[PDB]
Design a protein around this ligand. Sequence first.
Ligand SMILES: *[C@@H]1O[C@H](CO)[C@@H](O[C@@H]2O[C@H](CO)[C@@H](O)[C@H](O)[C@H]2NC(C)=O)[C@H](O)[C@H]1NC(C)=O
Ligand SMILES: *[C@@H]1O[C@H](CO)[C@@H](O)[C@H](O)[C@H]1NC(C)=O
Ligand SMILES: *[C@@H]1O[C@H](CO)[C@@H](O)[C@H](O)[C@H]1NC(C)=O
Ligand SMILES: *[C@@H]1O[C@H](CO)[C@@H](O)[C@H](O)[C@H]1NC(C)=O
Ligand SMILES: *[C@@H]1O[C@H](CO)[C@@H](O)[C@H](O)[C@H]1NC(C)=O
Ligand SMILES: *[C@@H]1O[C@H](CO)[C@@H](O)[C@H](O)[C@H]1NC(C)=O
Ligand SMILES: *[C@@H]1O[C@H](CO)[C@@H](O)[C@H](O)[C@H]1NC(C)=O
Ligand SMILES: *[C@@H]1O[C@H](CO)[C@@H](O)[C@H](O)[C@H]1NC(C)=O
Ligand SMILES: *[C@@H]1O[C@H](CO)[C@@H](O)[C@H](O)[C@H]1NC(C)=O
Ligand SMILES: *[C@@H]1O[C@H](CO)[C@@H](O)[C@H](O)[C@H]1NC(C)=O
Ligand SMILES: *[C@@H]1O[C@H](CO)[C@@H](O)[C@H](O)[C@H]1NC(C)=O
Ligand SMILES: *[C@@H]1O[C@H](CO)[C@@H](O)[C@H](O)[C@H]1NC(C)=O
Ligand SMILES: *[C@@H]1O[C@H](CO)[C@@H](O)[C@H](O)[C@H]1NC(C)=O
Ligand SMILES: *[C@@H]1O[C@H](CO)[C@@H](O)[C@H](O)[C@H]1NC(C)=O
Ligand SMILES: *[C@@H]1O[C@H](CO)[C@@H](O)[C@H](O)[C@H]1NC(C)=O
Ligand SMILES: *[C@@H]1O[C@H](CO)[C@@H](O)[C@H](O)[C@H]1NC(C)=O
Ligand SMILES: *[C@@H]1O[C@H](CO)[C@@H](O)[C@H](O)[C@H]1NC(C)=O
Lengths: 499, 658, 138
Amino acid sequence: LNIAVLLGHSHDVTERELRNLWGPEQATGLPLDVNVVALLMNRTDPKSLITHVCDLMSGARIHGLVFGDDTDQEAVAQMLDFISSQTFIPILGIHGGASMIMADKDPTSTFFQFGASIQQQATVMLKIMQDYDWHVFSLVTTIFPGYRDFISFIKTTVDNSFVGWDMQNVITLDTSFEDAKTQVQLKKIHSSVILLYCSKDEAVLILSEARSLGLTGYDFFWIVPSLVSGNTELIPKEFPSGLISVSYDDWDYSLEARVRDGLGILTTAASSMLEKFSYIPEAKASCYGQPLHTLHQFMVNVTWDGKDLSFTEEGYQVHPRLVVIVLNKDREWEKVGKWENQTLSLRHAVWPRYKSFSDCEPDDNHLSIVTLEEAPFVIVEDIDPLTETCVRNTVPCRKFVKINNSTNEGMNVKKCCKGFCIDILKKLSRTVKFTYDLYLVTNGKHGKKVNNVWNGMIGEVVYQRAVMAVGSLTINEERSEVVDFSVPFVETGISVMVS
Amino acid sequence: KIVNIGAVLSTRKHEQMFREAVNQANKRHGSWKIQLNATSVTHKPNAIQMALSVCEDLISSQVYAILVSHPPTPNDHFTPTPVSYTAGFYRIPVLGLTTRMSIYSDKSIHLSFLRTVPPYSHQSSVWFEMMRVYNWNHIILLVSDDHEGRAAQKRLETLLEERESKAEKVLQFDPGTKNVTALLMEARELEARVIILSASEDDAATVYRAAAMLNMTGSGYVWLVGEREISGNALRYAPDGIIGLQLINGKNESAHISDAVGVVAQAVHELLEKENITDPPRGCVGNTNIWKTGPLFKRVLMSSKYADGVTGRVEFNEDGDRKFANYSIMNLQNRKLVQVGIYNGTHVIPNDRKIIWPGGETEKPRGYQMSTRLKIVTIHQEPFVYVKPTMSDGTCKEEFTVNGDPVKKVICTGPNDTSPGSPRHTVPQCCYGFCIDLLIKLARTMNFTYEVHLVADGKFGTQERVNNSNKKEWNGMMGELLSGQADMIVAPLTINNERAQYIEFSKPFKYQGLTILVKKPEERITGINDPRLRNPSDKFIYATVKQSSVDIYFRRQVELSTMYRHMEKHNYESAAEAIQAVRDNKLHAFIWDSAVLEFEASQKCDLVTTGELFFRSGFGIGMRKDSPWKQNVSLSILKSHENGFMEDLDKTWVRYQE
Amino acid sequence: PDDNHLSIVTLEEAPFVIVEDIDPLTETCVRNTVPCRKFVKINNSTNEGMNVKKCCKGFCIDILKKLSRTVKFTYDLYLVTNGKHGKKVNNVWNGMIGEVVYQRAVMAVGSLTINEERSEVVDFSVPFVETGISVMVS
Ligand SMILES: *[C@@H]1O[C@H](CO)[C@@H](O[C@@H]2O[C@H](CO)[C@@H](O)[C@H](O)[C@H]2NC(C)=O)[C@H](O)[C@H]1NC(C)=O
Ligand SMILES: *[C@@H]1O[C@H](CO)[C@@H](O)[C@H](O)[C@H]1NC(C)=O
Ligand SMILES: *[C@@H]1O[C@H](CO)[C@@H](O)[C@H](O)[C@H]1NC(C)=O
Ligand SMILES: *[C@@H]1O[C@H](CO)[C@@H](O)[C@H](O)[C@H]1NC(C)=O
Ligand SMILES: *[C@@H]1O[C@H](CO)[C@@H](O)[C@H](O)[C@H]1NC(C)=O
Ligand SMILES: *[C@@H]1O[C@H](CO)[C@@H](O)[C@H](O)[C@H]1NC(C)=O
Ligand SMILES: *[C@@H]1O[C@H](CO)[C@@H](O)[C@H](O)[C@H]1NC(C)=O
Ligand SMILES: *[C@@H]1O[C@H](CO)[C@@H](O)[C@H](O)[C@H]1NC(C)=O
Ligand SMILES: *[C@@H]1O[C@H](CO)[C@@H](O)[C@H](O)[C@H]1NC(C)=O
Ligand SMILES: *[C@@H]1O[C@H](CO)[C@@H](O)[C@H](O)[C@H]1NC(C)=O
Ligand SMILES: *[C@@H]1O[C@H](CO)[C@@H](O)[C@H](O)[C@H]1NC(C)=O
Ligand SMILES: *[C@@H]1O[C@H](CO)[C@@H](O)[C@H](O)[C@H]1NC(C)=O
Ligand SMILES: *[C@@H]1O[C@H](CO)[C@@H](O)[C@H](O)[C@H]1NC(C)=O
Ligand SMILES: *[C@@H]1O[C@H](CO)[C@@H](O)[C@H](O)[C@H]1NC(C)=O
Ligand SMILES: *[C@@H]1O[C@H](CO)[C@@H](O)[C@H](O)[C@H]1NC(C)=O
Ligand SMILES: *[C@@H]1O[C@H](CO)[C@@H](O)[C@H](O)[C@H]1NC(C)=O
Ligand SMILES: *[C@@H]1O[C@H](CO)[C@@H](O)[C@H](O)[C@H]1NC(C)=O
């Protein structure tokens, strides 16, 4: 039917491709009287919003509104929901503040957003934390609402988990902080990874405080949702370089593809409802002077171009494109992870450090440690295929296994390690308080000088890929020449086995 | 020097009194050159044009706080959402004066919304004070709506956190139906009689007509409603003698207009004390810059402490509502709402008006039926609960002990086997033994009768996952207790953390731990400290009963995960299956409580227990939540501990060796 | 507005609460022990006594330390000078029961038997050790 499409001005988006994006497209056009009106608007105030709505609803009875925001105001989606409630016109949130997740839609509304729920996004963030083995965490929230369902979903997920998520309790803030009483709440944090759920300026103030509190370290990770970030074309100040964000503002899922998918959903709903009822165009007359066959109760399971763009009861995409990004060393947001219907397709199995989160950060504690497979000391087992998590009395590790014998390609399969020296490594990590990155050696055994080239754990220490050799290792003169041992902790000489 | 203040009201004399009170407040608060102008906007049938008038009239006028002031709206829309949604774009604090809705109580959609009237959630505070004063314990939540009822139940549980008591029956359903007599009939057969109603006017009229059809106007019915239940024909359909609450001068408009003046003017003078003086811009040409002192001036509105007020001392809470909720307690006395209560916030003061009740006396005590029938569930364990079919039909065998004592049996109700094993064979059978005699002693000590049934499946009950929402639900005896199918678990309940995380317990009657039953040359295994069990094999077959406390205790200890990898191979349903397996050498070890294995070692000479005792726990009576049987039964069990009654129960089955 | 200190009284029992003098080499309770005071009176007629600091250790002290690790609270552990565990001497409880009933102590973390009248006057927690009675012979 008659569909209005208005967008912002960001992402180098002109208007002529919006003219050419409806015409030759929609090859399977089942309704007859379908037309589009593509407009733009610099003003993002609700005055101009109500003005353009009353100009386009009377503008030859437009049955569908497509709005795209470029700013970072979450109340614009609330105003669009109010417009969809008053005018009974299906409105699709596309970009910016129009695409931001609001709290509770009306059941008598027709407004829908192209965004994931807070529960699916918390599931993605806990999938990140499970795949990267960051188990002890906390939660800092302000009085900016939507946090109660978030805390409830986190508690029900931890109660329904086989990981064993240790968690210091949720830190709440009272008011606009004087840095007097909320600082006592922030000093309670002694964990590594902190989850932050608040608005944008509140996130700027809290991250500036954590910079002043020294909570932006190498071990101190911050994972924020899309409500913190807002938009990818504007990256503000006082974000640590390595800030993990989960959003969906991708250039790959571009704004032209956004409005094309929106037109596809609208025409699919109108065409599949046209086979049920005849008089599908039934629009509101005017804004002045004061319905059963509606498209709201119909598109629960809608699919265009093979893309599962089905809509939930609360107005969410069932399988959207969740994008996990980080802040690089050059103040940009690099795309790291994409999300399937069930799994999270990651790019870096080993977590990249992003060492300079800020300027003054001496980070000399990411100690790379190699170890060797032995039966009484380093028990190396597969991860549990039913839970995809090492049991908490073990440590994670990786092994570089070459799949194909033809070339030197290989993969870092993550496995579990336990035993005697693993307990030594854990007690050193809990006494000296250092981070450790453990991996198996792939070149072979302990090591031997062959053609004046060391290998094994000795070679990994000498060629500086391994900081220390925690795994089981003997001591002779040549090793004490080429490396330096610690004190001996177990009396292990040679011995003869007989029957 | 002038500042336009937005008012949303029709009748112009209210704005005249508003300007008069604002001028009086500006006269007595310094010689600063500020002026406060007022702008009025009126009724429109179309909310789009309401939002149009608000945006093209007030935002360009540089308003600071817009007042929701439409009480007498004849339409059933009740939408000041144009005002709130327009002023939320610039974080302007919207002040409400008219309604008490939960959609405005939530800060989620309406961010900076404060108001001078507390919502219907503080009726739960008043009713909690009524339960504290007039000794009421159990309630019934009857909500015909769905939206406000969730927040009402959340505030109800937040206020009942001090007692940790909950409602026996909470209800949420679709309005506009007339077939709720089934739900009222199911609420009739319960024990609580304090009924809480919170719905619309027509929904209240419908449920009052349904209660009149089910003649719930009799004695013992404790009705306690708000103000939406005494309006219209719901006032007529209400029973004569129902207790409600009413706004003290809430419908009187100029009182809270003057209260809003006394808040807003001195809040402006408090905002002019400190720095960061920002103003909302003229939102006409692209003026979408956020007002940075939104939360700051909101905090000025939150910490607003005054003494003036016709209704009383106005003060705002930490939730944007009104502290110290005070309401008139009304009674429908012969088709007349009579003010039978003038409320002080800490104690209730009834006046000299007689409270005519539909039931009996003029007082309002607790109304219950003292739980005359208690459903009791147990599980099949022979040294604790012997379960046998009857002799001919219902009657039991008059069995005599070694001292001529007739065994005091009970007619339990049990199935033949599980649902795959037995399609439908569930009969009243005979049950007796240890815990049965304990239950008979408790039923003789305290003054109540009971009912004994059996568990459906063959499990104790663990917090196991369910398909939808990936939620860990319950099953077994706990799954039958929490579903209301049982009233008090009298069974060998191994007390641990997770079972006590949800329900409360009693003091244990039996104190023992865990041990191993084996078959007995070096034929010894000797308890948990065997490294042959630490590193198992294919011939050391050890397992446990499926979904028991043994699996919970060996699942918490992750260093015992290896046994957790083994016991899943041969999990059984009942312990007698494990006894028959270990007697025929199908099982090589079995982790179990000490009493049953020592009893079977007394019965059978080939079955030999070990001595390494671990996880010294207690068998306690599985109890409910906050309930009037937690203290009396515990004192009765401790009275059984102090004398030799537990010695006599040992002399029945436990102590005697064979 | 905060509150985490708990006035806690205990009583000396030889496998549970061992109360010893402070080490004179360091003037410090050794790390498994916790500090406490004892209102020592040198002689009978003088009511005035000195709160001499001593060191508590044992089983219930380990229980109190692990509870302070988990529940994250503080305490002021001290000893009783009224006498033994508890006995209603003409509607007057003595010892730890007289401390808790008359609210001079918040809770008695120290070792204490449970019977009917003690469960009447105060409230107990879940039990943690199987302690009935027994008879010692040769
Ligand atoms: C201060 O209040 C006066 C009240 O009269 C406002 O005057 C009104 O302004 C509107 C808009 O221009 C007119 O439609 C009315 O007719 C005016 N009232 C009359 C009868 O004079 C005045 O505009 C307010 N000041 C500001 C700047 O808003
Ligand atoms: C809107 O129009 C003004 C006119 O000068 C222009 O400067 C501005 O870039 C446009 N968009 C924004 C960002 O306000
Ligand atoms: C899609 O949803 C409708 C209900 O709106 C249902 O009737 C239909 O079976 C679903 N489509 C499929 C999978 O057949
Ligand atoms: C989930 O994933 C695929 C796409 O990767 C999708 O086609 C299908 O619906 C689902 N399949 C599985 C493995 O459940
Ligand atoms: C190894 O090579 C084969 C083809 O020879 C290919 O099928 C396989 O995918 C390769 N391994 C990888 C990349 O996993
Ligand atoms: C080398 O070849 C074998 C052939 O089955 C296969 O396991 C895999 O391709 C390679 N194995 C190794 C050694 O990784
Ligand atoms: C439904 O309503 C009818 C008529 O009022 C009544 O007879 C019937 O018992 C009700 N059914 C139930 C029990 O829900
Ligand atoms: C009304 O009261 C009668 C007793 O007079 C009893 O049958 C029942 O409580 C109700 N039955 C009817 C007719 O609704
Ligand atoms: C509001 O209450 C006051 C005090 O009772 C009264 O004087 C006044 O007339 C009322 N307001 C109205 C309706 O004018
Ligand atoms: C009860 O009402 C009086 C008079 O209106 C006033 O003191 C206050 O509003 C209430 N008292 C309380 C709750 O302290
Ligand atoms: C309620 O009682 C308290 C008792 O001090 C008092 O402070 C308050 O003003 C009373 N409210 C009234 C007057 O009803
Ligand atoms: C119990 O068991 C079988 C089913 O397994 C059933 O058919 C039979 O009737 C029952 N037998 C007895 C003991 O009554
Ligand atoms: C127990 O209750 C019954 C009434 O149900 C009555 O005999 C009396 O109140 C009580 N009897 C004794 C001895 O407790
Ligand atoms: C989920 O459903 C499957 C059947 O599809 C069933 O085998 C399984 O036991 C169920 N699991 C849970 C967690 O309830
Ligand atoms: C518990 O015991 C006391 C003893 O007098 C009794 O007064 C009280 O009513 C009992 N509670 C219940 C609910 O039976
Ligand atoms: C208590 O008695 C001893 C021995 O007679 C004496 O040395 C001491 O001074 C007395 N202490 C007092 C005076 O309290
Ligand atoms: C008085 O105190 C002393 C210890 O200082 C003790 O030896 C003596 O028995 C006490 N006198 C009596 C009988 O209370």
